[model samples]
Target: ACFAAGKDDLCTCSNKTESSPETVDCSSKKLTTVPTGIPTSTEKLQLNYNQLTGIPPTAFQGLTKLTYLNLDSNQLQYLPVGVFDQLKNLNELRLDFNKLKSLPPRVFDRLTNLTALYLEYNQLQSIPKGVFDKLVNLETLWLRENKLQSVPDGAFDSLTKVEMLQLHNNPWDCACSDIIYLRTFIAKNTDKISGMESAQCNGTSTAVKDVKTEPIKNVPC
Candidate 1:
């Protein structure tokens, strides 16, 4: 194999060319931990469908050239701080289909170049303030099928360049805070929300169902 030269024990180059980044495939291994010995020249990494539960803070220490990373279908419940600090050039990150309940503060503060992020099918209940404030260049965001109940005010204000925003199938608490924030966002940003037509709200005293309707009043609980 091309990796026999110790270029990377966890990956192999297609042509062993020294000019281009190598594509690494380590998916479906059912491994218990993230693999070591990944080359710094690796561009794309496939780590999906594994038994990985945790990631060390230095797991991606020298992978500065990494652009694409897939960690879907794993058992990850939490990530250590500074785990992705070195991945400044990362463009796409897939953390879908995991057991994640919440993300630490500023976990992705270094990924300013991130454009696409997939976080669907998790157990997340809330997103901390300023979590996505640094993703000014983000274009796509997926947050479906989660346990989200509320969104911090002005949390999505920094996402001016976002083109796609998915927030369906969430147990939204239709309180005054939740409805007001969403309503203001809809009025200001015309035609930006992707699933607004099907966006519904529940767990409120009033009869406000559809979030877009004007019946959403500050009714007393």
Candidate 2:
């Protein structure tokens, strides 16, 4: 019972060798709230599958060494931008399978080193402009099974190193003029995007990547 040995009442951890452990596992704690005092040395955290609904802005304060964090399959409907401000070194983050309807501004602006992000199986209907603009080093992003419509012009332009991007099973608005960027992106990055069949217009079954973008004479958007 590694968890029971903690007098501090935090989640279970790896061997207590370096004053503080580098890995922590709190999954299935029946957690109603985020466990406080996550050691600054913690590199990997497992907080998936709990009753967690909300995160305090300062819950992860001082966790500068955190490289991996999983908040998947929770009841989290919202997260504050400041919660991740200190996790500058994060390499992977999992926020999938939650109730999140939308993301706030600059929520992930500090995760410059992140290489992978999974936000699938949520309720996100819209992506805030520039939300992922700061992830310059990100390599993989999964945004499948959400309620997304059209992508912001440059929402993902900053992901210079992205190798895989999955955006499927969502009701994409390929008709809107605003969606031109995504259409162009699909055409250009056809090799990089996965699930091309489902990334279509509202009622069109054709993939946005192959959809003709020939402009009309006097159409409004």
Candidate 3:
């Protein structure tokens, strides 16, 4: 059954107690957080275009079989630490158009089965040193229209399974002042997923000065 909002409605799926279902679309609810009392049989959960701020650790404690989650166009800053740890079978997670600034250390450490990650139109400056270290099975990553300054030297070490990585329409300062070394690192690591010609940079005048692990010239020690 589908539930819509007039003033403030509540939904309780008591009969649908199966372990997994096919789909659930609860979009445009104007909700500020995750809904409670969802049946365990839900496989696809669509909660996009809401007012979510952040997720709690225990919020999704029982949704182990969920494969797809859509959380775009929300007000989330950063994901709760270890929020995706239990999602072993989750393949697609959409977090675009949020107010995300930075990810916690090892945020994706436990998501071994994640395939698609969407983080476009967020406020990300620099990802954690090894943020993607755990997503070894990630296939695609989208990061369009974000505030990325540079990619850390080996920040892409963990996303080996990535096939297509998008880094477009962001305010990337390629002037070698903020994170020029990151540019060289991507240039050196040719076989990486996000470094191949497609990952263009903006705001920079010239290529990184040298081919060393030293810091970028404009960046201070």
Candidate 4:
């Protein structure tokens, strides 16, 4: 099938029906970097399972209507700030199973309408504050199996709409003041947390099993 003249320039576009959104499949194509000339009309794009190491600042340039993006199972170590700023309508993003160690604090600033974000199975050690503040509409967040030590204060305050939080398999510091934000968050929103029973702490003062069960105390050090 071929796109009409002056349509998608460098991508293979397809639609299921007249009413469906255009899908661009660029996954597993051995792509080392993001391709250019993707149609602005593209709604769902697949770029997973590739060898991409990084995304250019103009990777998603002009893709304003894009909603679903799959960059999972890639070799991306980082993304440039404003790389996704044009994807304002994006709702779901998959970045799991990658080598991302950190992200620019404003990387997701323009994704206000984002609902579900997947960042599980990465090398992230910490999250900058206010990174998720603009994602007020976010509902499900996946951060399982990372190198996180402790969540920064106010990280989840803007995520009240989030229902499912996957945060297991992280090295959590369980000192009383170190985890006040996490403790308070879990206490108030225990029902939204997954893997809470198995989530433990890595500290001499706190038990190594079920960190939440141990009460926060003011005992002398």
Candidate 5:
């Protein structure tokens, strides 16, 4: 309760113990990167509302007990390769409202117990294949308002238990041969998503609801 939420940049603890502390709220502190001075004992940390360019390769250096890390509303471009390697106890990760280009290939090989992921309003171009292959316990994924032109084939194969996948407000291109795989897949899974059939081409097509999700019964191999 001592250096918890609603208080930023006022911690004096330098180590972890049973009664050291629980939560550390550094939200809205305009932090450029994760504070290097915090003790590794920090359990719940909030680093949202800053100008962070991207996650460093050595962030959370000694904070092995970190359970929640919030980096929302930052200027992050991408994550460091294998950045989450150390946080084995990490359960919840919030990276929303940043300029996230992509998660590293095989990034989730660590953090096996990860549960919730908040990734909205980022600069994601295309999710790489097998990106979520290792997140065996991932329950909820919030991916709304990003630049996902197409969802890769077998993209959700690893996310077998995923309950909610918010993929709204993305510009899905229709009629393009490159988007054929995505267009066909969305048509068959119409109940799982909305507005996939309402999409039209702005360059050469008009009111073109020609690509229906019902026709393509399966994702083309």
Candidate 6:
């Protein structure tokens, strides 16, 4: 009853502790900020459909018990660099449908335990180098519906365990040299990724999944 959903108590705590852990829900309250005083004992949290435009660096400070955290459909534009510094136990994180335009390369560097990450439906235009190198156990990555022009080389070299990659609906340059690594990466793991048929390149009638890298001697598409 202490964590009951109300004006003072923003989140609703799950009562079925036998079959489930301490899952908290604080979504759809027109919340302009993260609910203060989230206990460290909780493992799952949902803050979707809120009005959060940005999160404080210490918002999740002591939430080491967090495993799954959702911040979907907010008005977020960016995140503080160390926002996830204390989320060592975080397994899944959803940040889709926000207005994020940029992210620090080391923002998720400490999230070594993270498995699934949702970054879909944002305004991200580029992938920072080594941004995902530390996520060795990552299984699913959603970078769809962004503004990415081309994926750089070594962008996913460390995602050895990645299974599903969503990279559709972004502006992709079809130039052979620009997508050399992208074309090869897609071809190498076509089955592991979704939206392969729809991930097409710009200025050409070719999809990224079906495009092939050209010979070194004859570059350019």
- Winning model by TM-score: 6
lDDT for residue 126 in candidate 5, whole number 0-100: 72
Clashes of each: 0, 0, 2, 0, 1, 0
Q: How far in Å is the alpha carbon of 155 misplaced in model 2? A: 1.9
Off by over 4 Å in 4: 1-12, 16-19, 193-197, 203-221
Residue pairs clashing, model 6:
none
- Tell me the lDDT of model 5 at 49: 86
- Where does the lowest 10-residue lDDT sum fall in candidate 4? 1-10
For candidate 2, the per-residue lDDT at 197 reads 38
Candidate 4 lDDT over residue span 1-221, tens digit each: 12532244345667645777788877777888888757677788888888899988878887798899999998988877778888999999999999988878888889999999999999998888888889999989998888887777788889878888877777777754556667667766777655454556764434333355346554211
Report the lDDT tens digits of candidate 1 across residue range 30-144: 7788777677767777788888898878777778988888888999989897788899998899999999899888988999999988999999978888899999989998888
Query: Where's the lowest-lDDT run of ten residues in candidate 6?
Result: 1-10
Candidate 2 matches the true fold with a TM-score of: 0.88
**Superior candidate under TM-score, 3 versus 4:** 4
Candidate 5 lDDT, 166-190, residue by residue in tens: 6565655553444655555555554
Task: List ranges where model 2 is wrong by over 4 Å.
Answer: 1-10, 16-21, 193-198, 216-221
- Once model 6 is optimally superposed onto the true structure by TM-score, how far is the C-alpha of residue 111 displaced, in angstroms? 0.9
**In terms of TM-score, how similar is model 6 to the real structure?**
0.89
Query: Candidate 5 — which pairs collide?
Result: 187-213
Q: Against the unseen true structure, what C-alpha lDDT does each candidate score?
A: 0.75, 0.80, 0.69, 0.78, 0.68, 0.81
TM-score of each predicted structure versus truth? 0.84, 0.88, 0.77, 0.85, 0.75, 0.89
Model 1 clash pairs are: none
- The reply for model 6, stretches above 4 Å from the true place, is 1-8, 192-197, 215-221
Which candidate model has the greater TM-score, 1 or 6? 6
Q: Give the TM-score of candidate 4.
A: 0.85
Q: Which pairs clash in the backbone of model 4? A: none
